[PDB]
């Protein structure tokens, strides 16, 4: 048993995204694009909110995960993911952040918010499989029947050594054997550096 | 007098041991039971390279491969 096995596949996660206090305009823009990756996420303006008051309210309302976005000198620098009610908590540093407007050939127009497929590539260690489990359960489960044939959106995590490249695309199945991708963004590199067994205070 | 000093020294030793144990857990889990305790790593002496256009292009080829082969990793629904 682990923190996910009881409810995995039975309930949709309920995710909250927020930022450190006094966020830069760049951090706010990043937080909206992060929110858009997660179809059952809400985003809460940080305001003057004290983090223990925020965590307790999210616990009270039975949210399942919090995603907290940190920055330094105007650049997003870390991501904290904590699973409720009792853990675990993953922290990773952020690098090579590129917002949708700065991605050549990124889609323009509205992004359909269907439940995405996920791709995890290259997580060949117990540590890697632990990170996959934490990330995977931030997205709702999908219907298994004809899953391999339906959908139009995918979030992709590619692990090389200790870093994870993250991408977000919509796609059109143009034929039985061909697909066109349109990148939604953001792009970024995530480097996990802490996994603790509990939650935030 | 000399034994309150020893209390603080042992406090420092315990704190250093806790750090060491959390780092060894990270190192061990990243080699290929092993996932039950706090783990951390200080990557201090490593920069993170820029992502070349070649790498982003191969990620696109990976994604098309997975879509056309139906090889997806999300959780699937079940009955309780």
Residue numbers in the entry:
A (entry chain A): 74 to 274
B (entry chain B): 475 to 506, 515 to 562
What does the study report here?
The Mpp10 complex, consisting of the long disordered protein Mpp10, the uS4-like factor Imp3, and the Brix-domain protein Imp4 was identified at the center of the 90S pre-ribosome adjacent to the UTP-B module and close to the 5’ region of the U3 snoRNA. Mpp10, and its bona fide binding partners Imp3 and Imp4 have been shown to be involved in chaperoning U3::pre-18S rRNA hybrid formation by destabilization of the intramolecular box A/A’ helix of the U3 snoRNA and stabilization of the U3-hybridized state. The heterotrimeric Mpp10-Imp3-Imp4 complex is an essential 90S module, which is localized at the core of the 90S pre-ribosome adjacent to the UTP-B complex.
The final structure contains one ctImp4-ctMpp10 complex in the asymmetric unit. The overall fold of the ctImp4-ctMpp10 complex is very similar to that of Rpf2-Rrs1 from Aspergillus nidulans (an) and Saccharomyces cerevisiae (sc), despite the rather low sequence identity of ~17%. CtImp4 exhibits the typical BRIX fold, comprised of two anti-codon binding domains, of which one is completed by the brix-ligand, by an α-helix provided by the brix-ligand, ctMpp10 in this case. This helix contains several conserved charged (Glu536, Glue542 and Arg548) as well as hydrophobic residues (Ile545 and Ile549). Furthermore, there is no beta-augmentation on the C-terminal subdomain of ctImp4 as observed in Rpf2-Rrs1, limiting the domain complementation to helix α2. A striking difference to the Rpf2-Rrs1 complex is the presence of a long α-helix (α1) at the N-terminus of our ctMpp10 construct, which interacts via a tryptophan residue (Trp500) with ctImp4 at the interface between the two subdomains of ctImp4 (inset). While the completed Brix domain results in an excellent fit to the density, there is no corresponding density for helix α1 of ctMpp10 in any of the 90S pre-ribosomal particles. A tryptophan (Trp282) residue at the very C-terminus of ctImp4 would locate to the same position as the tryptophan of helix α1 of ctMpp10, suggesting that the current conformation may be the result of truncation and crystal packing.
